[PDB]
Amino acid sequence: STVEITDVHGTVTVPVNPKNVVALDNRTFETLSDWGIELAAVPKPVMPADSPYVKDESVQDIGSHGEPNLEIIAAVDPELVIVGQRFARFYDDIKKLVPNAAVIDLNFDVSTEADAPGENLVNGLKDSTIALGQIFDKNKEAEQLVADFDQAIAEAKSAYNGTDTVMSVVVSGGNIGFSAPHSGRVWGPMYEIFGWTPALKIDGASSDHQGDDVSVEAIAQSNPDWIFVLDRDAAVSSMTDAVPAQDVIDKSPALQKTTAVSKGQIVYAPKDTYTNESIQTYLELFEELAKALT
């Protein structure tokens, strides 16, 4: 049997329980692994080191997103390619390489070009989960994930008091970058989901994966009630000299006098978030936000 899968580009016929799947979407690897889906190839350098697919010698390695070996996709001859986040720019190239595969694009827009990044994130993760449940005959598991996600969102919304200000940062290489409202990496769309009041707004905000450049003193002058921290380098397997984000924040002099540090109102996203921006990661993050903000 087959199913008609609608993505941002159109609708494509996908075999149910397809063969020789290539998966390229950081947001859905953990779902596929939890469901026991066999994969033919994945881009191992962009994935969490602990992923079972990374550790499996029988899963071929497409390589990094900067320098991929897309020819392996043709050699695998897949029935399905799952494109997402870091491989979105290769969607047209992949369709040309494997014109007989169903190629689905599960990248949704959380960039500065999105007018609704919060809804794109929430509906995008739900849509990706539902589509994969249809393709892999995991509809009950997909429904449960979506229901758990909706409930986690509701609890984290209820926990936020509506007045505390929020500073969101990406720590990389010892630097504290700004994750701007709306478009900031990981945290940006969450401002829209939860209605967080920003501690700081800057000109020229972007989606820079390292955050936008801001001085520590500018962050400190905004005196946030909360600092929410993405540890970029902790998630990346090839970054072996990494300084944990907790150490960077704890020893940043200008931040010490902020209300956030003074009250211990700092939340760190899970270690693998940067390479695993998935429902499963956000169930953990939203549970921790709900506990902290209450």
Residues that bind ligand DBS (CB under 6 A): 46, 65-66, 85-86, 209, 236, 275
- Residue with Cβ nearer ligand DBS (161 or 240): 240
- Residue with Cβ nearer Fe ion (126 or 209): 209
Q: How far is the CB of 114 from ligand DBS (least distance, A)?
A: 14
- Residue with Cβ nearer Cl ion (8 or 72): 8
Q: How far is the CB of 46 from ligand DBS (least distance, A)?
A: 5
- Residue with Cβ nearer Cl ion (13 or 163): 13
Token duo for residue 126: 């739900």
User: Does 166 participate in binding Cl ion (rule CB under 5 A)?
Assistant: no
User: Does 13 participate in binding Cl ion (rule CB under 5 A)?
Assistant: yes
User: Does 9 participate in binding Cl ion (rule CB under 5 A)?
Assistant: no
Q: How far is the CB of 106 from ligand DBS (least distance, A)?
A: 13
- Residue with Cβ nearer ligand DBS (15 or 174): 174
Of all residues in the shown chain, the one whose CB is closest to ligand DBS is 209
User: Does 190 participate in binding Cl ion (rule CB under 5 A)?
Assistant: no
Residue 65 binds: one of Cl ion, Fe ion, ligand DBS, none (C-beta under 5 to 8 A by kind)? ligand DBS
Q: How far is the CB of 85 from ligand DBS (least distance, A)?
A: 5
Q: How far is the CB of 205 from Cl ion (least distance, A)?
A: 4
Residue 9 binds: one of Cl ion, Fe ion, ligand DBS, none (C-beta under 5 to 8 A by kind)? none
Q: How far is the CB of 209 from ligand DBS (least distance, A)?
A: 4
Residues that bind Fe ion (CB under 5 A): 209
- Three-class SS of the chain: CEEEEECCCCEEEEECCCCCCEECCCCCHHHHHHCCCCCCEECHHHCCCCCHHHHCCCCEECCCCCCCCCHHHHHHCCCEEEECHHHHHHHHHHHHHCCCCEEEECCCCCCCCCCCHHHHHHHHHHHHHHHHHHHHCCHHHHHHHHHHHHHHHHHHHHHCCCCCEEEEEEEECCEEEECCCCCCCCCHHHHHHHCCEECCCCCCCCCCCCCECCCHHHHHHCCCCEEEEEECHHHCCCCCCCCCHHHHHHCCHHHCCCHHHHCCCEEECCCCHHHCCCHHHHHHHHHHHHHHHC
Residue of 193, 167, 200 lying closest to 282 (CA atoms): 193
